[PDB]
């Protein structure tokens, strides 16, 4: 039968920004994790609520693939029960999370001489993000009593900022492509088993 398209998620040319993170719905396929078992290029491989083993003998209903690019120091924030800019304003995971987090260094693909300014993240927000919530609005953030009315100035800021990737930075500041897989099991019959 059909095999799940993990290669398209992992081996894609373009990755979305963290604030406008991408999500893909994988269903009606057999999932083969032998592609992930031995790769020698992954810097992070942590699975929450299920062992890395036993994945080929487990059946699930839906599998979601979330992909974005962040810096190395912010990879630790992609985990249940974490706080920070990325966790509170860009991407949130539930406390009771069943899934895996995979990250690898993409310094040779997403960094160019002079600075790559195509990846953005949100600085200001009124309230913390709920789990699996996506925000893409670009309205001017107001930090004072005076209304902004679209005239940027003091106490009226644009809520997005650029990463500015350079090839000479440290591994903490180098870009990392992060793929987050979320497995949900419901009363519906299993569709992704992968024996």
């Amino acid at each position, epitope marked *: 039968t059909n*095999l799940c*398209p993990f*290669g*398209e998620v992992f*081996n894609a*040319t373009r990755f979305a920004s963290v604030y406008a993170w991408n999500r893909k719905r994988i269903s009606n396929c057999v999932a083969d994790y032998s592609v992930l078992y031995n790769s020698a290029s992954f810097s992070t491989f942590k699975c929450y609520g299920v062992s890395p083993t036993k994945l080929n003998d487990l059946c699930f209903t839906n599998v979601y693939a979330d992909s974005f690019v962040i810096r190395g120091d912010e990879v630790r924030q992609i985990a249940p029960g974490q706080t920070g800019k990325i966790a509170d304003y860009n991407y949130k995971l539930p406390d009771d999370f069943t899934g895996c987090v995979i990250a690898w260094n993409s310094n*040779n*693909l997403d960094s160019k*001489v002079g600075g790559n300014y195509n990846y953005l993240y949100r600085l200001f927000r009124k309230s913390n993000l709920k789990p699996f919530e996506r925000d893409i609005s670009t309205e001017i953030y107001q930090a004072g009593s005076t209304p902004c009315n679209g005239v940027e100035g003091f106490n009226c800021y644009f809520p997005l900022q650029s990463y500015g990737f350079q090839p000479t930075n440290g591994v903490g500041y180098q870009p990392y492509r992060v793929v987050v897989l979320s497995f949900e099991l419901l009363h519906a019959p299993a569709t992704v088993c992968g024996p």
Partner: antibody
Amino acid sequence: QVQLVQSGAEVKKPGASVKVSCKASGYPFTSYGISWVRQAPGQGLEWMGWISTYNGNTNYAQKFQGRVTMTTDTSTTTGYMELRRLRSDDTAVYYCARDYTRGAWFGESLIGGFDNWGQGTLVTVSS
Amino acid sequence: EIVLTQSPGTLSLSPGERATLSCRASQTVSSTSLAWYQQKPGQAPRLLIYGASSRATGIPDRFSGSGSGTDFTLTISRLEPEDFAVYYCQQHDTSLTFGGGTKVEIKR
């Protein structure tokens, strides 16, 4: 053990149409698309199009946007290319390649190329 | 669209030397969308390098590739008798296009 076998050489009169075949075996058919490239005698490679074996989307070249159609039969794992309104300058060698440049399920770009090829079909259109 | 020009058209060398090829693009092309192909006479082309820096399955260590931006280079450490053929470069950043081709010949 991944092998693709094409049909034999053909000769057609101008104004007709020719449909080529490409049988695939040794890999999951639905996880890879099929790309077609032709080479004029003594010239370089010229791209024709790409087809997906999961949903059926096609991404043809602008030059052949009007007179090409591609179909895949999942049961027989065979791809076909049909070129209509044959011309004098359409004599070339047509190739069939397994695709790793555009995904089949989602349709986005990938890191790779055409990993496997076929023997090729010689098409002669002369009056 | 992006137009790929390969220079020089012909390159005559003796076995045991090294070969350097150039694939130039009119615009900026990401390294994720470049590939190299080798075509021996009378045979279908075969993939050598994908991603401009990665070797394919079954490809010997002789072939290496590097480059970024608008210029790319293929490097061959040693020229074996079966390494004389035509080479092409392709891109899929904006549509798909092929280069003119560079031919490597034995010098006498």
